[PDB]
């Protein structure tokens, strides 16, 4: 882990969520790709994975497999909480052989309508927070920026600015991140994806 770089941050607003990530992929100091997206979505739930890129791709494929089978069997899209439990169980199934990843789940429950964000450790310990979740090689800078900037009950327009500023300023202080950023603003029925202009790229 910590050889490819990458940072993801999720925040909860008023009837909406935001999830942003960097785009750098590299082999230690050398930069390889500036288009390596680390955010995926199944149904209406979004997942960001930091750490080893191979494990990120493997987990994305496995979770797409499981979510498609779930939709076929239950005739219903999976909710963020059930997906969080599934991810935690899958991560714990690899005890002593863990995937070197940091996962973060975001989304709005279709039925209840409230936002939901959560994070996972190496072996699938669920960390549910009502304000923000951070992951990556710049987690300390992300924690500082989120603690300084975040406010409860933010409109999507203000939430986008807050999360973008936090991500950009955290990435500018990390050597293994900052080759482009992408932000998802997720509402009850509409999702907006935006690319950010930043230095070093």
């Amino acid at each position: 882990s910590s050889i490819n770089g990458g940072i993801v941050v999720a925040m909860t607003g008023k009837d909406c969520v935001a999830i942003a990530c960097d785009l750098r992929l590299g082999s230690q100091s050398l930069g390889v790709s500036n288009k390596f997206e680390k955010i995926f979505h199944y149904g209406h739930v979004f997942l960001g994975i930091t750490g080893l890129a191979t494990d990120v791709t493997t987990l994305n494929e496995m979770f797409r497999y499981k979510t498609n089978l779930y939709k076929l069997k239950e005739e219903r899209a999976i909710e963020p909480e059930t997906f969080t439990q599934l991810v935690s169980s899958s991560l714990y199934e690899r005890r002593f052989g863990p995937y070197f990843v940091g996962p973060v789940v975001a989304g709005i429950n279709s039925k209840s309508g409230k936002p939901f964000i959560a994070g996972f450790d190496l072996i699938g310990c669920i960390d549910e927070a009502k304000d923000f979740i951070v992951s990556g090689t710049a987690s300390d800078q992300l924690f500082g920026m989120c603690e300084s900037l975040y406010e409860p009950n933010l409109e999507p327009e203000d939430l986008f600015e807050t999360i973008s500023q936090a991500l950009l300023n955290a990435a500018d202080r990390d050597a293994l991140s900052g080759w482009g950023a992408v932000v998802y603003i997720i509402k009850k029925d509409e999702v907006v994806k935006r690319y950010l202009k930043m230095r070093q790229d």
Binding site: R76, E81, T82, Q85, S89, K111
Partner: protein, 233 residues
């Protein structure tokens, strides 16, 4: 004719049992048979809880049902729970039970189970549901149904009685009338076993402090409640 037809005959020779689904719940009812006053009826249960929201009743060979209840309880945790952190919906649990019965039918050197199951349950995004599982391994949803010995007359009465606006109390009343019309011996609260899948009961959870955690929807009526209901017939 094969082993499945013989198991169906054995089911037809068993005690009746019923099942009625209303708009806001499901009612299961059956009669306990023990032609021995020395034996204690309370030690034997014919309605078994599978999950806090799913219960089952049977007609046929008792020991087979006793083994199948334990198998279903184990499979409700091994397969769905401990993965998604919640109890399975009624359809998936019924499918797993039908898979168990199908494997019993198809396995060599093993005879099929001689029971038919009526499974009642509730789940989110699907409401209340009632299903019947045959010894072969095929399950069918029902609005109101009966099995066992006097199943033909019970089915006729249910067809003449069931409608779309039926409520839980009306379903209980109809089930009690159907049981009374075909009771083999003695019709009182100690010989009737009735359960309902309905509203969540916070007083049966056992603890307080978690607002999201709700009580079970399965509720087994006591002898006193059954006697009070019979006093209203």
């Amino acid at each position: 004719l094969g082993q499945i037809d013989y198991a169906l005959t054995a089911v037809k020779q068993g005690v009746t049992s019923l099942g009625i689904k209303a708009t806001n719940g499901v009612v299961i009812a059956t009669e306990k048979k023990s032609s021995s006053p020395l034996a204690m009826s309370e030690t034997l249960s014919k309605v078994s809880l599978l999950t806090p929201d799913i219960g089952a009743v049977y007609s046929g060979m008792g020991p087979d049902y006793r083994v199948l209840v334990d198998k279903s309880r184990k499979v409700a945790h091994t397969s769905y729970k401990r993965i998604y952190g919640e109890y399975p919906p009624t359809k998936l649990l019924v499918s797993e039970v039908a898979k168990i019965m199908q494997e019993a039918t198809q396995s060599g050197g093993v005879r099929p189970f001689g029971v038919s199951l009526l499974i009642a349950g509730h789940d989110e995004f699907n409401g209340f549901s009632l299903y019947q599982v045959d010894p072969s391994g095929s399950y069918f949803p029902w609005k109101a149904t009966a099995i066992g010995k006097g199943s033909v007359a019970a089915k006729t009465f249910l067809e003449k009685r069931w409608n779309d606006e039926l409520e839980l109390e009306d379903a209980i009343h109809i089930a009690l009338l159907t049981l009374k019309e075909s009771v083999e011996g003695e019709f009182n609260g100690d010989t009737i076993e009735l359960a309902i899948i309905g509203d969540e009961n916070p007083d049966l959870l056992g603890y307080t402090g978690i607002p999201t955690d709700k009580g079970p929807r399965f509720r087994k009526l006591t002898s006193q409640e059954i006697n009070d209901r019979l006093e209203a017939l």
